[PDB]
Design a protein around this ligand. Structure first.
Ligand SMILES: *[C@@H]1O[C@H](CO)[C@@H](O)[C@H](O)[C@H]1NC(C)=O
Ligand SMILES: *[C@@H]1O[C@H](CO)[C@@H](O)[C@H](O)[C@H]1NC(C)=O
Ligand SMILES: *[C@@H]1O[C@H](CO)[C@@H](O)[C@H](O)[C@H]1NC(C)=O
Ligand SMILES: *[C@@H]1O[C@H](CO)[C@@H](O)[C@H](O)[C@H]1NC(C)=O
Lengths: 340, 213, 215, 340, 214, 215
């Protein structure tokens, strides 16, 4: 038979399938998608004008900007691919320094300076590890905003322009959020944060390709009223949405969580070969521990003072980690792995 | 915890091969089967790992299209399969127990599976004795194993004197090697000396008695 | 990837001395307060063995003459006193970031006092001559250093065709080398010449060690 | 050529096109759609057990409830369709009253009582016009919450159960919101509320098929922190999302807007044949006026004290209306049509 | 604001008709063309309205299946079409300017389009003069008998401009018969000439009859 | 729908009197503080014309003797003093809610002082007698009241066959009626009888007004 559907010229129009729940839903609106697993081929950051960019770095380096830290992994890939062309522009212009772009290890830490657009001493180091002769407080950071999207099938370009003033707040042009019935998502080029209502609204799982240190923009936050920073599971300083969707009963902010892994998977489930019990006598919450020692021994018995089961767990390249509240009931023995 | 890898293989260009690594003494928490490719006297290349109980696998970037790690929980055995095969794939592939990323080292190692990718045909070797009309205090004897494919052969002298085994060289598309033994001249040729040449890839054994003209 | 560069490529140390190898990583291999760096020994034809795990921990059942040091970018495997068994190639490897990577290796060679090669000449066998070919074989046994020149003379004229040489790896017990030179010609070509000579000149003496035979 | 896309079985999966901007986006996530234009064919409210419902109305009426007001337009259509089946249930149970269901006029006014679930005087009146001998405060209201969805092509059933206690907050199982880059929607079976960032985030346009009087749940709200009720264009009392997206620079809450129309279309554009100018000399903001006289004369010249252009306007059955801030420049004269 | 409606229509049962209404002097903001159906001397029914510029249209429930409103902006004209036709549809359809729901009144009206739904065929009338050798007074009345025409109506004019009386047409045997009388002073007749002019548009026949005595 | 019921269905009023018509709505026609009610006058054969718009507003250029009043459901049109022109039907209409609805109408008939009918008798035309038919017509012009019965006498026998009568609308100028009586026969039947008579009995006189002619 026949049904009737509304479509609009300038909104996302189409049909979409939900295999479980077996729902074909067609209409017009906004389709929030998970861009996390596809990002390297699907999106490409691109600087607006490499010539004018080099000029802005010259003015910065002249003014004492030691280096740059990318905010987002996409920005790093952008610097690596434009670095070779940048150095050539600087050479032709009798500038006495070079631009070097290193890897992105772990957290994309925040620098305190900015790169103002234009109309040793000898290396301008972008990212890589943290270096004392190039302190973060001397690097520019979060210096790009999105000017336009370059939409095409396959790849999509994202053209960037330099900001004029400093801001800790993430660039909302890359961000999204969505909720329907009993499911909600805050999402990013690098964050996918799922919350759901089962009797009560809580954080159910998240996926991180990067850990950034911009602040999540309130305008792209669901349920942002009356939020307590101490109650945010994903900490505010690592871009956690300042939202009550970012809550979870019995857990507090994961400031010492394994965010150093730089890339990780959060959910609520036991780690392989462990058990957690609620015992008020447990040790207090502290920096998250990895369930496996340096010698590959698995830690059997864990506990938490007043968390709620299932346990908050982070899975990484190097194994499983438990939230700050979970502690080894057998106390410290052996070679424990803790985050810094 | 002891790792037993499958035997050597000769496979034609463009085919596919699947080799094994069985791990006794394993537990779910460890027992990550890592795989590494090493050509003769070269750097080791890391391929990836697979955990037979978890079925967790990780590949390095170079090998994503080439290797496929698969698993049998029950036999607690790891399988590694090598996609489009070329002469560039001929090397020794080592299986070794490890753990996840920042955990432990390669504790125990398998014996290594040698792979030969070639159009050439299996050829059993010729064994020629090597004996000297002049006399000394000490005498050296040899066996010349010539014209066999593929590597390798085993030359044992009486099955258990000083022995030397010399590496195989390729000439006209087949391998040639030699092996020498040294005994005191009071012993030879009154005593008998036989070299046993075993070429498993053709499953032939050739013994030669050493006598002087 | 994290690149490990090992130096030196090859190192020669005499019995009882101290050998020092270094491993230099392109990025810090340190996490959680550990250095994720390891040292392996590989005897030829054999899988490697672990010696030092983490920067500086002696593995079970390894002689206490092996030792490790360093952190972050720089590491050092030291052997003191180097012994006869230690003829092997030595590898450093890291497991701080994927992919796991290895060093290029340091082939450790032992120094002993020179010894001259016991040269032996072998006519072609009776079984070989019937299949249409003949290989004259020369065994140069137990010499050091590895440098050596082999020369075949037929009837007093030199020969440069069909000569193939194979060296052994250094001895696990006596630390000498050996080498088989094999001059391969046709059977008929074998009958046109009467006297065949094998001449090997070594660092021991200026006058070469000669062996010959006649029909 | 070939591309790479992430899909998930238990999310909204598919491809969707945006004609302007020519963006085909494929992936998995959340598809928030505009359900207002298709609702009559697409969704049907349905009570769980007409027997259990019938007994609860008897128990309510014995406790002094004379009637009900529907919370939502769908709920009213439900009472109309089930009334024949309920009254048959009541006669078999010798209940001394009958159930009569009337139209939905204008705002869906709010009742103050509740219908508690189970394990003159003669009529239990549902909806209809406002009646003093069965006043709102004697009627139950917002008594249903969604139990399960009936997922299908064509029609979707929405099965509802009576609540256990009274609540002013709308039923969040029916509601949704989403935002991506610089577009945002709050959305409902009857409200579609679009906001966008053009230099600044503001309310852009809305579509109302009903005007209801529940409160919009914070949990489904974008940017719900620090909202001043006086600045919410759609008033909180008619379900305005308590969000800074429900703002518009220079306008205040439209408590006296033409919400009586019961169904209307809000955006920011001049009405046909009128002009608005920013003039401090204008009259003060007051109850909304219709741009067409009682006599069909069009009112040419309008102004506002300190609003911003384009002017906030509502389109309705009987014509065009301007937001409260807009006033006739010729001051009060003529035959004016004003709202409540 | 001047409204001009289409001409009369004769249509077979079950067929369809589309009549027009052009509106001069209108603006975008007013100019809602309403349509009403009035059987002879019966209540007016509201059908709906259409705005030639807006394409806003609203139909009444009774007419949703029956009428269809369309518009041409440049012509600023409204069109109404009547789907399957029955004798219940034979009436006068009025076009008239109005507004939206609680707005204005019916300011101005077009003249009205008469629709006659019938299988019968167009038949022009016969015109017979009516004159009185008898008694005479200071006034003599003359007449014309218009007999046997279909469909209605005819216009009977006397010299184009005295007191005149026009009599409603009656149905006999499926055709119409009407008459028209005029009174002029008998000093003028028959010394003066007097002619009754009968016009029947649907047959496009015009007949004059000169009035002379028997 | 909002149903307008108008009372009375028909009204007879004398020149100069006060006329009152009422319209009763089934639901309130009041919104925004106005009464969305209107009064129309329709002369026969003509479009309707507005008199009062909203409850109580005199239409521009409508004589001030018309007046309107009321709110919610009950409304009243007053004409004072009613004149000869106002012989017409009067409609009320509402546009508070769709569908717009009208009243059924009030037909106003004027009362004047009674008047006698001017009777005229007309033989069948010369053109008609040749075509196969003959119709004798009698015109009764400018009488009041409207009720009247006519009598045709053919040669002294009353005649009741094939006679059709039509009444006109009340004249707007003198407030009188008229009527045409038509005797329809075959052509031959007319010539069989010689004398024809038209006889009208009216409220004016007891003895009928007679008009006749012969061949
Ligand atoms: C060295 O670098 C500073 C900023 O880092 C720059 O302003 C200056 O021009 C450079 N050279 C000298 C000689 O100071
Ligand atoms: C939802 O809650 C019920 C009972 O508390 C539980 O059985 C079910 O597994 C839960 N689902 C989740 C947490 O996804
Ligand atoms: C009238 O209705 C009330 C509730 O509205 C109920 O409690 C009461 O019993 C009823 N009275 C009678 C006489 O039935
Ligand atoms: C965007 O903003 C400019 C001025 O800031 C305005 O002229 C333009 O119409 C806006 N576009 C919209 C609202 O679509």
């Amino acid at each position: 038979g026949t049904e009737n559907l509304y479509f609009q010229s300038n909104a996302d129009s189409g049909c979409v399938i939900n295999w479980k729940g077996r729902e074909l839903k067609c209409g017009s609106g906004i389709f929030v998608t998970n861009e996390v697993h596809t990002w390297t081929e699907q999106y490409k950051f691109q600087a607006d004008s490499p010539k004018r960019l080099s000029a802005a770095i010259g003015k910065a380096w002249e003014e004492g900007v030691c280096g740059i830290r990318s905010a987002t992994r996409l920005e790093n890939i952008m610097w690596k691919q434009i670095s070779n062309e940048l150095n050539h522009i600087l050479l032709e212009n009798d500038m006495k320094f070079t631009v070097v772009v290193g890897d992105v290890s772990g957290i994309l830490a925040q620098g305190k300076k900015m790169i103002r657009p234009q109309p040793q001493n000898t290396t301008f180091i972008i990212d890589g590890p943290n270096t004392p002769e190039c302190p973060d407080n001397q690097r520019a950071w979060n210096i790009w905003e999105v000017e336009d999207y370059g939409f095409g099938i396959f790849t999509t370009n994202i053209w960037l322009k330099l900001r004029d003033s400093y801001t800790q707040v993430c660039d909302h042009r890359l961000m999204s959020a969505a909720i329907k019935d009993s499911k909600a998502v805050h999402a990013d080029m690098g964050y996918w944060i799922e919350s759901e209502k089962n009797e009560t609204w809580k954080l159910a799982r998240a996926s991180f390709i990067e850990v950034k240190t911009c602040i999540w923009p309130k305008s792209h936050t669901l349920w942002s009223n009356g939020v307590l920073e101490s109650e945010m599971i994903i900490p505010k300083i690592y871009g956690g949405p300042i939202s009550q969707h970012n809550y979870r009963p019995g857990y507090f902010t994961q400031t010492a969580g394994p965010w150093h892994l730089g890339k990780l998977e959060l959910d609520f489930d036991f780690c392989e070969g462990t058990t957690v019990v609620v015992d008020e006598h447990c040790g207090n919450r502290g920096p998250s521990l990895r369930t496996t020692t340096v010698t590959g021994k698995i830690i059997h018995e864990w506990c938490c003072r007043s968390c709620t089961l299932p346990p908050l767990r982070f899975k990484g390249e190097d194994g499983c980690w438990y939230g700050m509240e979970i502690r080894p009931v057998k106390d410290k023995e052996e070679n424990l792995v803790k985050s810094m | 915890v002891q790792l037993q890898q499958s035997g050597p293989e000769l496979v034609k260009p463009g085919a596919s091969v699947k080799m094994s690594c069985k791990a006794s003494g394993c537990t779910l928490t460890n027992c990550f089967m890592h795989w590494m490719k090493q050509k003769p006297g070269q750097d080791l290349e890391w391929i990836g790992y697979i955990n037979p109980y978890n079925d967790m696998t990780k590949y390095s970037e170079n090998f994503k299209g080439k290797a496929t790690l698969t698993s049998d929980k029950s036999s607690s055995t790891a399988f590694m399969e090598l996609s489009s095969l070329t002469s560039e794939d001929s090397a020794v592939y080592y299986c070794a127990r490890g753990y996840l990323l920042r955990t432990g080292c390669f504790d125990y190692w398998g014996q290594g599976t040698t792979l030969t990718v070639s159009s050439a045909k299996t050829t059993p070797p010729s064994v020629y004795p090597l004996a000297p009309d002049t006399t000394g205090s000490s005498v050296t004897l040899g066996c010349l194993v010539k014209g066999y494919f593929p590597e390798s052969v085993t030359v044992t002298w009486n099955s258990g004197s000083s022995v030397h085994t010399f590496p195989a060289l390729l000439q006209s598309g087949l391998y040639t090697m030699s092996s020498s033994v040294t005994v005191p001249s009071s012993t030879w040729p009154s005593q008998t000396v036989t070299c046993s040449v075993a070429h498993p890839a053709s499953s032939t054994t050739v013994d030669k008695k050493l006598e002087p003209s | 990837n994290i690149v490990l560069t090992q130096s030196p490529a090859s190192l020669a140390v005499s019995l009882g001395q101290r050998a020092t190898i270094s491993c230099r990583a392109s990025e810090s291999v340190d996490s959680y307060g550990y250095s994720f760096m390891h040292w392996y020994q590989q005897k030829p034809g054999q899988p490697p063995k672990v010696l030092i795990y983490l920067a500086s921990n002696l593995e079970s059942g390894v002689p206490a003459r092996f030792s490790g040091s360093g952190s972050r970018t720089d590491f050092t495997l030291t052997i003191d006193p180097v012994e006869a068994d230690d003829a092997a190639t030595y590898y450093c490897q890291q497991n701080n970031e994927n992919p796991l990577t290895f060093g290029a290796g340091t082939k450790l060679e032992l120094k002993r006092a020179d010894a001259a090669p016991t040269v032996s000449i072998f006519p072609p066998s009776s079984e070989q001559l019937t299949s249409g070919g003949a290989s004259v074989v020369c065994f140069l046994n137990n010499f050091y250093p590895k440098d050596i020149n082999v020369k075949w003379k037929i009837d007093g004229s030199e020969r440069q065709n069909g000569v193939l040489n194979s060296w052994t790896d250094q001895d696990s017990k006596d630390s000498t080398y050996s080498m088989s030179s094999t001059l391969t010609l046709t059977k008929d070509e074998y009958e046109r010449h009467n006297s065949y000579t094998c001449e090997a000149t070594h660092k021991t003496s200026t006058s070469p060690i000669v062996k010959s035979f006649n029909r």
